[PDB]
Amino acid sequence: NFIIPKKEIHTVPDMGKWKRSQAYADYIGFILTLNEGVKGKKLTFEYRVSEAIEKLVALLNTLDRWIDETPPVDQPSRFGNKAYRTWYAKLDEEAENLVATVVPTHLAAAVPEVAVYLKESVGNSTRIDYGTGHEAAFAAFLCCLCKIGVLRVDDQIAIVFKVFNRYLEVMRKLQKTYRMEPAGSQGVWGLDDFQFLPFIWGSSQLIDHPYLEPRHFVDEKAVNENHKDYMFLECILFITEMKTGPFAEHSNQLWNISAVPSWSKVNQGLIRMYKAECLEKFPVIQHFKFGSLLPIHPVTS
Ligand SMILES: [Mg+2]
Numbered sequence: 528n529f530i531i532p533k534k535e536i537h538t539v540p541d542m543g544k545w546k547r548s549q550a551y552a553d554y555i556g557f558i559l560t561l562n563e564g565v566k567g568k569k570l571t572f573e574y575r576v577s578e579a580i581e582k583l584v585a586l587l588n589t590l591d592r593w594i595d596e597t598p599p600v601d602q603p604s605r606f607g608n609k610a611y612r613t614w615y616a617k618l619d620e621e622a623e624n625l626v627a628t629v630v631p632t633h634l635a636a637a638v639p640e641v642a643v644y645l646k647e648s649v650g651n652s653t654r655i656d657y658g659t660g661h662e663a664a665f666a667a668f669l670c671c672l673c674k675i676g677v678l679r680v681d682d683q684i685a686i687v688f689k690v691f692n693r694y695l696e697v698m699r700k701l702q703k704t705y706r707m708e709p710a711g712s713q714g715v716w717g718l719d720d721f722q723f724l725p726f727i728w729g730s731s732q733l734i735d736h737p738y739l740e741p742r743h744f745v746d747e748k749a750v751n752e753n754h755k756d757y758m759f760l761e762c763i764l765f766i767t768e769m770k771t772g773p774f775a776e777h778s779n780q781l782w783n784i785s786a787v788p789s790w791s792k793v794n795q796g797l798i799r800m801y802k803a804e805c806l807e808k809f810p811v812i813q814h815f816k817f818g819s820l821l822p823i824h825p826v827t828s
Contacts, residue, residue: 529640532816535823550821557670562731564683569756574684582629587693607655611705615652644668658710659723659805671820729759733790745785
């Protein structure tokens with residue numbers, strides 16, 4: 528019964544149907560299961576890589592190549608570069624064909640439904656911005672693939688370390704290349720100007736790390752020397768290379784979070800925060816789309 532996912536959160540009370548939905552249960556369960564799976568593991572951990580995973584990475588690589596083939600254009604506006612729209616148009620048109628390389632031929636009926644999440648995961652073509660809402664769309668895309676059997680429990684680490692990790696690299700390229708802006712006012716009140724999940728999964732990786740403590744993520748040397756093994760630090764590296772000045776000024780929430788004593792507390796706290804700043808934040812999550820795979824109907828077992 529695959530169907531094109533559509534918006535269901537129109538009023539504030541709908542935040543309640545969302546919270547009670549199968550979609551919410553499956554989504555948070557997905558986020559938390561992966562969180563558990565990557566706990567205490569470096570990005571170079573030896574996890575199994577399935578054909579679907581390689582196809583997902585290939586999909587992201589195509590996206591990446593398209594960025595290279597679509598250079599920023601000179602323009603008067605000093606915000607998002609309009610070439611982003613040229614790049615996005617490619618994804619918008621080819622989304623299903625791309626997803627078809629990942630989903631098996633006999634489950635082609637699921638491709639249009641799944642592809643919607645992919646189209647909603649790389650930013651907004653109107654303002655040329657990106658926020659946690661788009662990131663959540665990518666997580667939903669992945670969650671849908673699990674529900675139809677493309678990704679299994681055995682792929683949980685790869686989903687974060689390989690697929691989501693590659694996705695973040697492409698997003699950073701998009702953000703830098705097209706001078707994208709943070710969605711809404713996320714640049715002010717959000718944990719980070721663009722992402723959130725990597726901070727959750729990334730902090731999970733670092734739980735009980737023998738040396739690295741949250742205070743080290745604002746330590747440039749620690750970041751510079753370990754980012755390739757830890758998603759959380761890679762995010763910080765992106766911040767340091769793009770921004771100038773003290774974290775207290777340009778990344779206040781993260782500056783404050785660095786004062787939290789343990790990665791365990793960072794992870795638990797970020798999960799709560801994620802639900803508060805993203806999943807329970809009407810302005811952000813209202814654009815979530817619901818279909819058959821992530822349905823709005825109350826959760827059942
Ligand atoms: Mg900010």
